[PDB]
Amino acid sequence: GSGGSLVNRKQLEKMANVRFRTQEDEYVAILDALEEYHNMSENTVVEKYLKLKDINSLTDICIDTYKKSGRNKALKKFKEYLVTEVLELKNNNLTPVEKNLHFVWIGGQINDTAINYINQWKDVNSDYNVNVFYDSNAFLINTLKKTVVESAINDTLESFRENLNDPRFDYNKFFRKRMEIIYDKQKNFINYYKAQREENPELIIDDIVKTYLSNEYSKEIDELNTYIEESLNKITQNSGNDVRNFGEFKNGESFNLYEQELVERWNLAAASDILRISALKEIGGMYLDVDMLPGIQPDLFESIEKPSSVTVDFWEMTKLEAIMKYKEYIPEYTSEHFDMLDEEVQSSFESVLASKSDKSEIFSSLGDMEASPLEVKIAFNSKGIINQGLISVKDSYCSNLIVKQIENRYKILNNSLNPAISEDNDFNTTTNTFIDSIMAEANADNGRFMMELGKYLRVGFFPDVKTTINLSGPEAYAAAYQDLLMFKEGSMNIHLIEADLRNFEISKTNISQSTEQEMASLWSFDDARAKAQFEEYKRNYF
Amino acid sequence: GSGGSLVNRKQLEKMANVRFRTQEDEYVAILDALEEYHNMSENTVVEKYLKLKDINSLTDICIDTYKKSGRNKALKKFKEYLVTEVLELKNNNLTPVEKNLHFVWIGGQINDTAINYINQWKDVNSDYNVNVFYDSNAFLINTLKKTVVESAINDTLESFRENLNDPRFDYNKFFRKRMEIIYDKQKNFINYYKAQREENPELIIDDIVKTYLSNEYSKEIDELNTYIEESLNKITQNSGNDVRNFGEFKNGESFNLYEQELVERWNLAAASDILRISALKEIGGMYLDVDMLPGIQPDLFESIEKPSSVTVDFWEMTKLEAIMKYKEYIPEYTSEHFDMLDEEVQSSFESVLASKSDKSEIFSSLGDMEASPLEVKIAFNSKGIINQGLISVKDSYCSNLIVKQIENRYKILNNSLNPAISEDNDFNTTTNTFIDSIMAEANADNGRFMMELGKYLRVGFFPDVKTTINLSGPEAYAAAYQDLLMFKEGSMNIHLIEADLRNFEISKTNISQSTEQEMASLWSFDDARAKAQFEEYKRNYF
Amino acid sequence: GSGGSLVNRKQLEKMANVRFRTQEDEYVAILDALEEYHNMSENTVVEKYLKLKDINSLTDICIDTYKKSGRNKALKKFKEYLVTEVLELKNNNLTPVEKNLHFVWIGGQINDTAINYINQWKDVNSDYNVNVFYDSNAFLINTLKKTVVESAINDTLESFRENLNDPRFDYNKFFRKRMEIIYDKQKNFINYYKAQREENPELIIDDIVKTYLSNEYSKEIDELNTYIEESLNKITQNSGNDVRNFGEFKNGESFNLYEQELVERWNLAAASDILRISALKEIGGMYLDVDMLPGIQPDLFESIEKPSSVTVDFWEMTKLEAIMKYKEYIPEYTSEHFDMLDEEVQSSFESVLASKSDKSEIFSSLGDMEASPLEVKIAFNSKGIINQGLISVKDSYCSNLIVKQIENRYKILNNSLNPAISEDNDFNTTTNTFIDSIMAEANADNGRFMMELGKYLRVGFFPDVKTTINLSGPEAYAAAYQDLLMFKEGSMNIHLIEADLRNFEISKTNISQSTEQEMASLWSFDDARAKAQFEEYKRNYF
Ligand SMILES: O=c1ccn([C@@H]2O[C@H](COP(=O)(O)OP(=O)(O)O)[C@@H](O)[C@H]2O)c(=O)[nH]1
Ligand SMILES: O=c1ccn([C@@H]2O[C@H](COP(=O)(O)OP(=O)(O)O)[C@@H](O)[C@H]2O)c(=O)[nH]1
Ligand SMILES: O=c1ccn([C@@H]2O[C@H](COP(=O)(O)OP(=O)(O)O)[C@@H](O)[C@H]2O)c(=O)[nH]1
Ligand SMILES: [Mn+2]
Ligand SMILES: [Mn+2]
Ligand SMILES: [Mn+2]
């Protein structure tokens, strides 16, 4: 029962006690509660936090009640200690985490390059129970999108032809016309889906998909049935956990959202950004994106020194490439940046790298893992946090918060979107309703969030759309931390600085982030990259 | 497992289902939840209510989300059923109540006329465990007030003398000048109390009181020590439960309020209006005001008929008076209205009344008592409900609500009052701060409540002050019912009509309300009665 | 009198002569003309070219007249020889070029960093007569733009405020709104200018500018008069040639265009892209952009070897940086990329670089220069050709062609634009007229050009606008080469491959292109860079 930095009643009395002034009904409130807190040795760390929560709230009443009170400045300082005490609770009182590596891939067949990445973990970590999530009901979501978007491109290009050299028809006008069609196609499928399921509530997703492709886009069903069969085998053989078995999630409120982004929006990224944390909440372990690889040993390459010209992320990227050239664990893991090196140092790798026998000497394993029940550790790329590496304890207080954050965001989204979408109109007129309504219900807190939310329809068919990040992605995790440290719930605007977020960083040595497929994930839909794609599409038909 | 009037999923679908329109993410929300409700046979009545609560809330989202939806008018009607279903839950599924008569008397020595009233209950109800609450710490609150107010009157009258026939110095100007002094005296005692308790946190209330009277108002302590001793004996002998033993209440949040109205405001009525419901919540039984008497038998006087001229409340008042003339259970229970009768009918009573042996044939006993865990039955005088007769089951859902109502009201009060009182000023300048701040933090809901709250300082030293009723009294109980039926929490403005409140009426036959002391408690501080008191005070000194 | 590769009459007869077929009136046409060509030893190289021109034209008649003729395939091959013969004429028969370095800077005061770059040339090349062109009439064009665009940004940002978080108001919508204002301001100045000059045809540009700034944008004239005076001194001292003295250009047709881009569009880049070639045509020498620096010696750094990681353009960029660190010819020429190097090789430079005395050992001079009267050599950056380095002989045949190209392009522009602009309307409605009319008068040759031309209004106030390049810039020079080799005049679509253009490349060793200011000029207005500027502007006002 560590007392921590947090001050004792008598100390706080000494911190404030202004001369010739009695104690109020509302000031003693803090003292009686703070005294209680220090007597909670036997109680859980989470129960200690909720007592701080109440203390924090009690103090900000006492400063708001009397804004004259000279105490304030001291009580303003007392708030700081509470934060530190929360951090001290986090770090000091740790619990063993459940040894469960989680992966997720839904919407289509699992790719082999993904499985190769998974196996790397699975090999070195024999003790961990790996669970690569999938969805039996939805193997044809990805192919549904693929068929539509491509069939929407073909239509859009032909609408131009007679205006191909006309400089009004630029990349912007193209995607805008494409999305107009994509929305119409995507919506049509929805109205079919929400009439087929309304008719026969024992039809799965795929059954509606395959039939939709058959009638409209002229696809033979038997070819799809071999695909789903080939998929189900491939995942089942590779430690496949179905989401339909995980009914704890389906019974939860976040499921509606999972399906929404899966079936209605064909946003697999979003769906997977939900499932991952909802998994950690109810199972406990480490979630990884499939593009991730395990940590290289600190020692392995401690003798070699870095070049001056090349950057640090380039160095870490080659450290990985070196492995896959000589030990050859993965088929043709590009040796691009390794062949952009000096031959003398290339041989330095070849020599020292081949001077180890098997895989245990290469990659460091996880083994025993400790983390607080208040925290959910998260990875850091160059540009902030990222939800590709999530350590968590079963039913963590943060893990909860993060889900409640996601739930509430989608609440605000749907409680503005669903009105607009229902009264069916053209894409453009829908978007101009959806946004208008958002801006009405948008204060000076959620302002910075709401901006991004307004682009929600455009997610995946437009450049520069960070909406999905503000829904199921990093922002939410940031908010949850703010919820923690501000002793509140449902913070939407983030005012936490990088340094504050570091308190929840998964140690860098556990995850080798600088993989090939992550640089393929990091393509980043820049406005410029879009233009070249338009030129490429324009090349195809002619 | 009674289904009740509440409609089944498929019925509600049929109620709304508009032609050619699909079901939304937000409409199915009701259906999936309503379906669940009907499958909760094994669950508690309270758990059923919370499921209705959530249903009610889900429906009012669905109507607010889409205000075009033609469904609305049907879903507007679905809300009505939910209320009825709550009422059907209340009435149909009953539980035996704990056989505990509760009485309360705090602030001073218990009066004998009060004890005589209590014993009447105690005699006929042998099975019930009676508990007459008291407070050992506070026997001298009432005498503290008595000493101050009287010493404030004496000062006020002498300030006039040289302006006695001047018509500016009316009853209004008198009480206004009196209160100005009373506040100053009352506050002085507080600053002493909150410095003595701050100095020696092992001093009780009385110890601070007796010393305050000794130094200032020239009272011999030993005379008080005989008073408190004579009191403690008198209550202990008469089934005395101390509030200091009932620590469950002291640990609760409502205790601050109990002391506030006891020690700071000397409002015994308010303190007792809090304790009564907080008792019912944690003990369960029937609370009665001490001025109440048990129910006369339906049969006893069924042969006699009423006069045409005299009113119905006069008849019930004499029915009681008749008992105490001939059977003589209570010393000189005024035979006023019985002697304002025809002698022929006087003898009709004398004859038929004396034609019964002992007390069991007179007063009907309570015996076994059933009530819902959702409800807290309350008495009805001529002018609405009244908290003089409260049946309740242990930890009722209403009993909770009522306390949470009282808690929140005092929250709003103190969160405006305590700012103003702290920066000590003249009474008038304090009141004009306290109110100003209330009117700032006052919307169109709490408006009607807030009005009365602004008179909080004047409670007990002014005519026409209904504040205490809007804090710890009826209004709160009304609100709690509104909270119930509107499936909300923290309703402040009441829109329930008498008929709606009847759903929580304690059957009239259980309580004989028309007692002597209740007509003495119903004096009602009218502005006119005040004037005559001023004239009476003005008589005294001259 | 070199005969060259071109075949003699009798040879060409042997090339075609199909058996049993007489020679036509139109076939002998080539033979009689080809025979003539070979007898023109005494004639000028330019006169030889025009004879090839006529030959080329005669042959393509003979193949078009009779499309059956089996000769065609041989005469198709004869066309190839003519091209080669033109190239052989170019290379073999050379003439000394006039030793005149030309620079240009108009619109505002000449910058010191520009002058420092110029002096580098001027020092090492003592024999060359340098001429830094300027315009006395227009020193305030740049400040006119600066005042407008900035005053248009300020207006545009304030139009947002109440929509700052609304995601409709993106970077695209900003510039679009800005340009709408900029056009209105820019046009207003024009209508004033073309009414002031119409009134008093002895008023210069500046006099109209300074007055325009005084009345509208609240500028004190005397501050401008010191600016123009400070400028005129600064240029006069640094080998300043005025364009108003060069009346040979003013009398030419291309002058209208010079003023158009100067006074009407405030496009200094365009104006300078015209003057440069019109200078070479009538003066002869080497034109350079001011951001250019002279060639580093082949020998100087022949001992040092390149790193493997860093790119080749990085190496050439540091070669320059190295000079300016130790020999220190120019104030704080950024030592960025030199400090991103290995210290061992840094010292390799420091050592070997400081092992030379004065500047002659560093930079290679030009001295005597030979080039054909048919050619105008042009520089090559990574992307393609570039008009930053132009060698030419006085009144070259190419130098002519290039001007005639520019003249004709602006013809097509104005003959579509001036109609639309005259009937004054909103910017948008003007642009939608201007383009519509272009697309009407646009065949399958000029198609690729016309696209870019339609963005002519947006030049300088929008991202991704290559119009100016297709008017006065590279494309024109490419066309002129196509005009040469296709024996045509007024080719608009270019079908020349990089390899073909190399025939007119200024040897790489003469120009050090990889300067600091050129990397500053190569910023390239990418759509993404635009967004960050919008965010930066949005930061400023708030
Ligand atoms: O068809 C797909 C593709 C991706 N994903 C999920 O989307 C995540 C995003 O990974 P990626 O590297 O593509 O995105 P990043 O976050 O690295 O930009 C993956 O981890 C998968 O869980 C999925 O569920 N289905
Ligand atoms: O000195 C006193 C007088 C009254 N009461 C309480 O106040 C209640 C109100 O009784 P009364 O009939 O005087 O008031 P009413 O509500 O009828 O006006 C009583 O039942 C007691 O519980 C008390 O605590 N102390
Ligand atoms: O205010 C200015 C700026 C530039 N220029 C001319 O524009 C040319 C373009 O040089 P820069 O390197 O800025 O452009 P880029 O390299 O992008 O063609 C310069 O050489 C100058 O002759 C000019 O006349 N006035
Ligand atoms: Mn990735
Ligand atoms: Mn009463
Ligand atoms: Mn440049």
From Swiss-Prot, chains A, B, C:
Q: Looking at the record, which segments are called Four-helical bundle? A: 5-94
Note accompanying the cofactor annotation: Has higher activity with Mn(2+), but most likely uses Mg(2+) in host cells. Mn(2+) or Mg(2+) are required for glucosyltransferase activity.
Residues annotated for Mn(2+) binding in this entry = 291, 518
Effect noted on mutating residue 105 to A: Abolished glucosyltransferase activity and ability to induce the host inflammatory and innate immune responses
Look up what happens after changing residue 466 to E.
Impaired ability to recognize RhoA substrate
Q: Where does UDP-alpha-D-glucose bind?
A: 104-106, 142, 272-276, 289-291, 521-523
Cofactor(s) for this UniProt protein: Mn(2+); Mg(2+)
Where Mg(2+) binds, per the record, is at 289, 291, 518
Q: What region holds the GT44 domain?
A: 99-471
Catalytic reactions of this protein = L-threonyl-[protein] + UDP-alpha-D-glucose = 3-O-(alpha-D-glucosyl)-L-threonyl-[protein] + UDP + H(+)
Q: Where in the cell is it found?
A: Host cytoplasm, Host cytosol; Host cell membrane
The ranges of region (Glucosyltransferase region) come to 99-471
Classify the protein's membrane topology as the record does. Answer: Peripheral membrane protein
Domain characteristics, as noted in the entry: The four-helical bundle region mediates binding to phospholipids, such as phosphatidylserine and phosphatidic acid. This promotes localization to the inner face of the cell membrane close to small GTPases.
State its role. Answer: Active form of the toxin, which is released into the host cytosol following autoprocessing and inactivates small GTPases. Acts by mediating monoglucosylation of small GTPases of the Rho family (Rac1, RhoA, RhoB, RhoC, RhoG and Cdc42) in host cells at the conserved threonine residue located in the switch I region ('Thr-37/35'), using UDP-alpha-D-glucose as the sugar donor.
What name is this protein filed under?
Glucosyltransferase TcdB
Give the encoding gene's name.
Answer: tcdB
Q: Which stretch of the full-length chain is present here?
A: 2 to 539 of 2366
